Amino acid sequence: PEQLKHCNGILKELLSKKHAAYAWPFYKPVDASALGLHDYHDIIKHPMDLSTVKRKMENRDYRDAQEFAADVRLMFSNCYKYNPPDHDVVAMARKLQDVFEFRYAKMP
Ligand SMILES: COC(=O)C[C@@H]1N=C(c2cccc3[nH]ccc23)c2cc(OC)ccc2-n2c(C)nnc21
């Protein structure tokens, strides 16, 4: 359960201001209506975002660090799945995932 404590620090890091230039699209769930996407939920069956991870973090919904990392990676996979690789939101996702993978790897 000490490793869940480190996951909270990783989540705080992703939500911090130093990464805001490429983390802001993942703060909240994809609002398909507001963005004009007519097919997002037919392609993405399990939406995920940083605020959902924070909510499940606070409600003790992650049994271990690997369940936490599975949700963070699901959020990036949804982005890679829905968007073409040339798209800009994908480039932001890769930067933020590179931050996450670095912090998750440095975990005891
Ligand atoms: C217009 O929406 C899209 O084409 C997809 C969308 N792009 C983006 C997006 C994010 C940043 C630069 C962008 N340029 C074109 C699309 C795009 C997006 C924007 C948001 O604003 C609150 C929230 C979520 C996303 N997002 C995520 C996450 N995964 N795909 C997207």
* Interacting residues of 63 by C-beta distance below 8 A, sequence separation 6+: none
Ligand 1: atom nearest CA of 26 is 28
Q: How far is the CA of 1 from the centre of ligand 1 (A)?
A: 34
Spell 62-74 as b/e; 16+ CB within 10 A means b.
beebeebbebbeb
Pocket test for ligand 1, best of 50, 89, 92 (most atoms within 8 A of CB): 89
Residue 41, token pair as written in the block: 């939920």
Count how many Cα atoms sit within 13 Å of the Cα of residue 26 in the half-sphere of its side chain: 34
Q: Whose CA is nearest to atom 11 of ligand 1?
A: 89
User: Rounded distance, CA 108 to CA 90, Å?
Assistant: 29
Q: Find the CATH number of the domain harbouring 85.
A: 1.20.920.10
Q: How was this structure determined?
A: X-ray
Q: Whose CA is nearest to atom 8 of ligand 1?
A: 89
Total domains, the chain:
1
Pocket test for ligand 1, best of 27, 31, 35, 94 (most atoms within 8 A of CB): 35
User: Quick one: resolution in A?
Assistant: 2.3
Ligand 1: atom nearest CA of 82 is 30
Domain range for 71: 1-106
Q: What is the 3-state secondary structure (H, E, C) of 31-72?
A: CHHHHCCCCHHHHCCCCCCHHHHHHHHHCCCCCCHHHHHHHH
